Amino acid sequence: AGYVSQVIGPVVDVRFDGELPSILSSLEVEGHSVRLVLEVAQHMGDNTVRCIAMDSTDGLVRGQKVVDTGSPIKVPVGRGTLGRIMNVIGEPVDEQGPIDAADIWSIHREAPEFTEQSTEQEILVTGIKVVDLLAPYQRGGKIGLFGGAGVGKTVLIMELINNVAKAHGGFSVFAGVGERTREGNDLYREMIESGVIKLGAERGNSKCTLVYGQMNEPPGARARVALTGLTVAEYFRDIEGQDVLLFVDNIFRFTQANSEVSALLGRIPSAVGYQPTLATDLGGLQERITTTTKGSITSVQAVYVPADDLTDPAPATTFAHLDATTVLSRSIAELGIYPAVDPLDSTSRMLNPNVIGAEHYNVARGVQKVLQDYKNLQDIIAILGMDELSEEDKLTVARARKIQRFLSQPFQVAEVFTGTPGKYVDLADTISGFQGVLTGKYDDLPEMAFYMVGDIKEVKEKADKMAKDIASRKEADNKKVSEELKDIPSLDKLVSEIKEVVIEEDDGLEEDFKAEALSSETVVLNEEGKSVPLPKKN
Amino acid sequence: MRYTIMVSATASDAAPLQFLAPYSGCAMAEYFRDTGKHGLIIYDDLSKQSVAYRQMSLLLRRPPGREAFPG
Amino acid sequence: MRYTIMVSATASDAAPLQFLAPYSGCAMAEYFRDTGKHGLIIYDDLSKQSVAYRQMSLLLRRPPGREAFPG
Amino acid sequence: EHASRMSAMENSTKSAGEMLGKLTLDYNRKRQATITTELIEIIAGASALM
User: Fold this and answer.
1) How many domains does chain D contain in total?
2) Which residues of A touch D28 (CB under 8 A)?
């Protein structure tokens, strides 16, 4: 009912002789290589709408028919999306059939209004000790994850998915906003490997819906894929009544994508370079993540800080919405502590005694003060000597050295390659455990007693095994037989056991090759449209 | 809340509503100023009303000045 | 050169050719990717391809963003 | 003397870290203002043609 009038990059003008589609409505370009969905951005006047494409616009002709769907982009939602991968417009890209839709929901939505909000401000127990104690998660809050590579971020993602599905019975959505396809495939196969995504007939027992808008997609597709993950999460909140987890992977890439679609629609950029609507384009996403009266959505958003500058407007606008940070550190991970949460740079708004109580608040502030007190004398130990200062200073060294161990915890999705069984730790057990180490009831137990264990009745069994291990050492000796002729042969024997592989100097490359003949003449279309040589006169 | 009016244009709301909400609350508190009573008004994050007004101005294509603000 | 293709859009070439040289070289190397073999593509000075694309887009009067670049 | 110098260069790195942090914050302000002012120049140049 409408036809393409302008194609300028990813930005398509469509003309409607009848009535116009609404802003944010979805339009299908009828007749194309792939499914080309446009989203109406503005009404330009003269019966033209201005749209932003969700796929490539190369191959688009002015006058191509465009069908208005009468609604915004509509995605399949429900339990049938679990363990599937969707793109922004709802198509399955995991190549495992269609998506069993419970409903087909519009991705564009107003935030849950004032009467629906929760005034309670309670804590989301996650089963991770360092996360539950020092930087708790608000049920319905937004949590910034300052991880990276090699700090065990993906294991923490899959464990929040696992522990929230195990404890509270809620499902998870992962919105891969603008992620590389190698990283997205790595996370997919690592979720299949860890059992939070199951393929085939066991597909219903998956805990996670992946919504992937990749980095090679146009800016309109990366700018809207977080809303698709939000819609999948809002179905579980509003219909299933669950405590959902949403993972917006790199909220900065959401910001950068919306900045690109604001630049492409010809809007004047605001401060440093961002979209003029940066606070509202971010708040439109973040205000739909809340606690309703039905359930909640808790959002764990990875935050990239642009030039290591926290006063840049994209992290300064994001940090207004965040309720907790969990900074994952490389220096924590190079002490073998997993999860690699920095126990001192992670913050939470939920850490005050009016929401968690004075018991939990004072235990957390004591633990944080003890680790801080150890932290600002390590330039006094390494300079002047280990046993140089007082015994009370070395008492805080030993207590913080064993609390710094005690924050580590074995993870249930990590047991398929580490062997050590993962241990969910409850909140009251975490409080009662760290209070005991803080007063000094465990000053006699070793420092390796507090390592990769669930709660306080496991550090005792760890030390019990370590002191049964004293009596298991006199069972044998240590020796290495046959100093020069156990299995170490002559080097000619070692080169005469390696097998020669086949190398050929015909490299081939003509295996299933067409070998068309390319014309050197330039071939154009005449006015009838047939392939004709160039008319040889200017 | 027996004595408080609570005007809210939250982060999801349109930037015209966030630009206008301190003026709405000021008109509500000027009722108490104008009839002899005393009012207290708290504009929480007037730095966000300025950002909403900057959004409105750059979407109206007015020339940005310092930091991008309309002048 | 028994294994190397060279795709060379030099400085005297037009800006659309410098824009399209990495895409054309990637199309030549995707032959080896797609038919089982292994490729190594080297886009030397993707900075200059970026400058050429910025040239074409400012001359087509697309709206400029940061430093002059398109969206 | 050596221990007094060890305590004197302890305060010097403290001072050269707090001065560095102030200077890094002010550099971040100048970086943001540079990008904004060059962008406003480019937009004003383009809007005077279209």
Assistant:
1) 1
2) 307, 309, 311-312
